[PDB]
Amino acid sequence: VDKRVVASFTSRELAMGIRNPRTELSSSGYGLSEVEIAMKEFIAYNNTESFNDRFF
Amino acid sequence: SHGGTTRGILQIRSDQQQSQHALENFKREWKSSLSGINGSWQIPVVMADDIKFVNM
């Protein structure tokens, strides 16, 4: 929190669950959000919504 | 990959062509007022002798 360690846990005390695993070495065991993959599409959506709203 | 996608040419015409300096600060007047989402619904007023747009 605020880029300082406020707590620590063993494998016994905390679960981690990931749906979209990767073998990629630099993935470092983290997942992969569809929000990351689709981010361009979400931005394009937001822009087209703002465009249509800005008529009014 | 290689084409000209250019929609058309905006022909502005008067007794003589603008200097390059005049034309580049007209480009600044244009982009600061009309580009992107920020400019998206504004209309320029221009008082040239004649204005034409050629569809290519």
How are the residues of chain B apportioned to helix, strand and coil, as percentages rounded to the nearest 5?
25, 20, 50
Instruction: Extract the tokens encoding A14.
Output: 């905390």
DSSP one-letter code for B35: S
Yes or no: say if A33 and A18 are a contact pair by the CB < 8 Å rule.
no
Yes or no: say if B54 and B8 are a contact pair by the CB < 8 Å rule.
yes
Residue B38, chain A, CB below 8 Å: the answer is: no
DSSP one-letter code for B19: P
- Gap from B25 CA to chain A (nearest CA, Å): 27
The bridge status of strand B8-13 relative to strand B50-55 is antiparallel
- Gap from A48 CA to chain B (nearest CA, Å): 9
Residue B40, chain A, CB below 8 Å: the answer is: yes
Q: Return the H-helix or E-strand segment holding B53.
A: strand B50-55
User: B35 to chain A: which residues are within 8 Å by CB?
Assistant: none
- Please spell the DSSP secondary structure of B5-18, one letter per residue: ---EEEEEE-SSPP
Resolution in A: 3.1
Binding-site residues of B, please?
29
Using alpha carbons, select from B23, B20, B21 the residue that is nearest to residue B48: B23
Tell me how far apart the terminal alpha carbons of chain A are, to the nearest angstrom: 42
Euclidean distance between CA atoms B22 and B14, whole angstroms: 14
Yes or no: say if B50 and B13 are a contact pair by the CB < 8 Å rule.
yes
B10 Cβ contact partners less than 8 Å away, ≥ 6 residues apart:
B51, B52, B53
Binding-site residues of B for Zn(2+), please?
29
